[PDB]
Structure 1
Amino acid sequence: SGAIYVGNYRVVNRHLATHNDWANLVWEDSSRDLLVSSTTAQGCDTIARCDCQTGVYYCSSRRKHYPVSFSKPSLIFVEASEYYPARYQSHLMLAVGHSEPGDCGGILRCQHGVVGIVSTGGNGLVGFADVRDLLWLDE
């Protein structure tokens, strides 16, 4: 679990969005596993606007942060889960690191701000849904 709070927006994994997120929907994209909802309170976070390929993510299944080198956002095949059929997930960044399904929502950050959130993983892999291209989150 986890979310990004920026301005009057809340960014969550689309597969973990609540009834309240859907009732306050701003934008969602199944191919990216993202959903953005509106909030009444002003948010705690800053979005990175950069091309960093290193950063640090929070891993809830270890209660720890880990440094990572990750790929640029791209279209990657993701196997079927209980939430989606087998498909290509877009705007996904992969890195070597520990992750389990419940780690989804953990933030990846660089020196410039929030880069994305945990969305996928495998045997020693962790995948992050990028949010740096969503310029409208800042206004």
Structure 2
Amino acid sequence: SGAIYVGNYRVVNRHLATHNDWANLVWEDSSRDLLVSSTTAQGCDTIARCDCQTGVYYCSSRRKHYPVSFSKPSLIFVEASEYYPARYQSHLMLAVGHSEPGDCGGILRCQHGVVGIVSTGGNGLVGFADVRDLLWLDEE
């Protein structure tokens, strides 16, 4: 579990969005595993605007933050998980590291701020759903 809280937006994995998220929907994309809902209180996070490929992610299934190198946002085919079939997922970055289903929503951060959230796992890789191209997250 986990979310990004930027301005009056809550960014979650689409597969973990709640009824309240869907009832207060701003934007969702299944191909990207992302959903954004509206918030009453303003949030503590800053979104990275950059092409970094080094950063740090939180792994709940280790209670640990790991430094990683990651691929740029890409169209990947993802093997079946507990929450999704084997399918192509867009705007996905891969790193070598530990990810189980409950790790989804962990933040990946670089020197410029939040890069994305854990979205895929397995075979010793961790995938992150990029959010850095979402420029409207920064206004309105």
* TM-score calculated relative to the size of structure 2: 0.96
Matched pairs, number: 139
Q: Alignment identity in percent?
A: 100
Gaps of 5+ in 2: none
Q: Aligned partners of 1:84 and 1:124: how far apart in 2? A: 18
Gaps of 5+ in 1: none
Q: CA deviation at 1:79?
A: 2.2
Q: Aligned partners of 1:3 and 1:26: how far apart in 2? A: 15
SS at match of 1:82: coil
SS at match of 2:12: strand
**Which range moved further: 122-131 or 28-37?**
122-131
Q: Aligned partners of 1:86 and 1:106: how far apart in 2? A: 21
Question: Which aligned segments of 4 or more residues in structure 1 are displaced greater than 2 angstroms?
Answer: 79-86
Q: Aligned partners of 1:38 and 1:134: how far apart in 2? A: 15
Once the two structures are superposed, what CA deviation does each residue of 1:11-50 show, in whole Å capped at 9, x if it has no partner? 0000000010000000000000000000111111000000
Q: Aligned partners of 2:127 and 2:44: how far apart in 1? A: 24
Q: Aligned partners of 2:82 and 2:112: how far apart in 1? A: 34
SS at match of 1:58: strand
* TM-score calculated relative to the size of structure 1: 0.97
**2:36 aligns to what?**
36
Q: CA deviation at 1:87?
A: 1.6
Contact 2:77 2:87 in 1 (8 A): yes
